[PDB]
Design a protein around this ligand. Structure first.
Ligand code: FAD
Ligand code: FAD
Ligand code: CB1
Ligand code: CB1
Ligand code: ZN
Ligand code: ZN
Ligand code: ZN
Lengths: 230, 230
């Protein structure tokens, strides 16, 4: 019954284009009767650094610190910092996780990279057995809503930036698919700073309109072929 | 005709494999007579978040905050946070910048992503126009020294992770090349955790051995063909 959505938002300005895309998502999904939660990373002063402060109590090896081993153990022993577990609860209950962010160096802003590094720990999002198709977050949907500085023409195979699917690889495949997420087609709003009002409105409207039927969408085939193939 | 090297290092543990690769680089480059500087991000508690705290002067637009616009202006006016300018000084003087880090979600750890986001600002690393082959850091060399959890086999075209070059795209092309850097071949030390003592010592020695002749190397053609073929 019903659907739960978590929006992980990474922009410093509420009045930004990203802020508007996040607000439109909240409005539309809320109108549909969906349960909606937003993790406004900058407003939360979310910690991006992976450090030993992410484990409470005593480390499984206070001699040599291995973040991966320590957090996996901490997860299984319920000894992770509360900011991390708070995010994990949101992800665990979510049916769909939308990431809203401006492209920073062909990737996500560092504060959001930190959310991924720290929240998607072994035991919670993946394990030796459960990864990719068997990812622990299988059954969940993920969607990247990104805005860019460069134009769509620049993001083509022969363009200066290469195809946008090229930079999506680490995020959609290396991260989301690895954790079991079914990946919905990305929403890319190209160069809003350069675009005109009519175009910007069209972009936000396209996002809102798309959200009207997001639950009918089928995941993309998150494969090397989709990202690089023909 | 000496050379200056900056190693941007991102690992929490001095006794780690990454720590050993960083130390081997310092040892060998120092032995060669090179000038060496290391930015130990975790030890420095380096700030990864791109926020308005990065600008100390009067904002160009105090109503709507745009990180790119404000940092570009702040760079020109010299009102950027000192931690950013401290890093820019190191980069400006360096002939070669080596990034030493463990792969985190097919990318760099968030603390290092933050270094890229905040240090490589407009006016310093690139201009518009003034990117890719016209980037402001032209004449400089960059090299990614990465360690992984996955094995070399997993990081091949037919591997579950796809070819290792795929995840290098956002970093080598979208970031380094965009800023004008000539990119030297990446050094990828695969699955040291699974490797045996002998195999690990071998990977470290291979890195040190390569550094002996690093100044005779040619950069790679940082193109889509190099990364994806086809
Ligand atoms: C460190 C850093 C690295 C970057 N790396 C890359 C990169 O690798 N590749 C790349 O392509 N780009 C890159 N960029 C560009 C960056 O992605 C863009 O600046 C950003 O995505 C633009 O959107 P943003 O600020 O929301 O837009 P705003 O600048 O917030 O949006 C543009 C305009 O939209 C208007 N607007 C807001 N709400 C609405 C609304 N509801 N309806 C209509 N208009 C509205 C605003 O007032 C504004 O004038 C980088 C930027 C930084 C700071
Ligand atoms: C949040 C997160 C995300 C990750 N994402 C990915 C991913 O997307 N893809 C992927 O492949 N991996 C991923 N990993 C795996 C991670 O990259 C590896 O754990 C790491 O790179 C291993 O190296 P590191 O800790 O130095 O190794 P250590 O664990 O530091 O090294 C392994 C062994 O090397 C030994 N050693 C150290 N120095 C020497 C020396 N001089 N001679 C001989 N032995 C030595 C150590 O004692 C240790 O037993 C991720 C990890 C985390 C925490
Ligand atoms: N419009 C573009 O060329 C552009 C602009 C910026 N800018 C203003 C912040 C960045 N970038 O910073 O990485 C990257 C690109 N990019 O396309 O590759
Ligand atoms: N050894 C591996 O399979 C491995 C381990 C991890 N781990 C421990 C953090 C990650 N990863 O998290 O993305 C990825 C891989 N990878 O190969 O694709
Ligand atoms: Zn995939
Ligand atoms: Zn390139
Ligand atoms: Zn390239």
């Amino acid at each position: 019954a019903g659907k739960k959505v978590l929006i992980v938002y990474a922009h410093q300005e509420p009045k930004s284009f990203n802020g508007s895309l996040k607000n439109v998502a909240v409005d539309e999904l809320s109108r549909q009767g969906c349960t909606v939660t937003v993790s406004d990373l900058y407003a939360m002063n979310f910690e991006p650094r992976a450090t030993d402060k992410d484990i409470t109590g005593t480390l499984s090896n206070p001699e040599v610190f291995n973040y991966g081993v320590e957090t996996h153990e901490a997860y299984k022993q319920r000894s992770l910092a509360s900011d991390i577990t708070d995010e994990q609860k949101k992800v665990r209950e979510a049916d769909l996780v939308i990431f809203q962010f401006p492209l920073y160096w062909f990737s996500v802003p560092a504060i959001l990279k930190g959310w991924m590094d720290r929240v998607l720990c072994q035991g919670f999002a993946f394990d030796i057995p459960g990864f990719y198709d068997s990812g622990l977050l299988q059954g969940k949907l993920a969607l990247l809503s990104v805005t860019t500085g460069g134009t769509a023409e620049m993001y083509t195979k022969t363009g200066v930036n290469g195809d946008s699917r090229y930079f999506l690889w680490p995020l959609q495949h290396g991260t989301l698919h690895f954790c079991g997420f079914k990946v919905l087609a990305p929403q890319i709003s190209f160069a809003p700073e350069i675009a005109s009002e009519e175009e910007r409105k069209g972009m936000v409207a396209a996002w809102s309109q798309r959200l009207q039927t997001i639950w009918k969408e089928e995941p993309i085939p998150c494969t090397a072929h989709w990202h690089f193939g023909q």
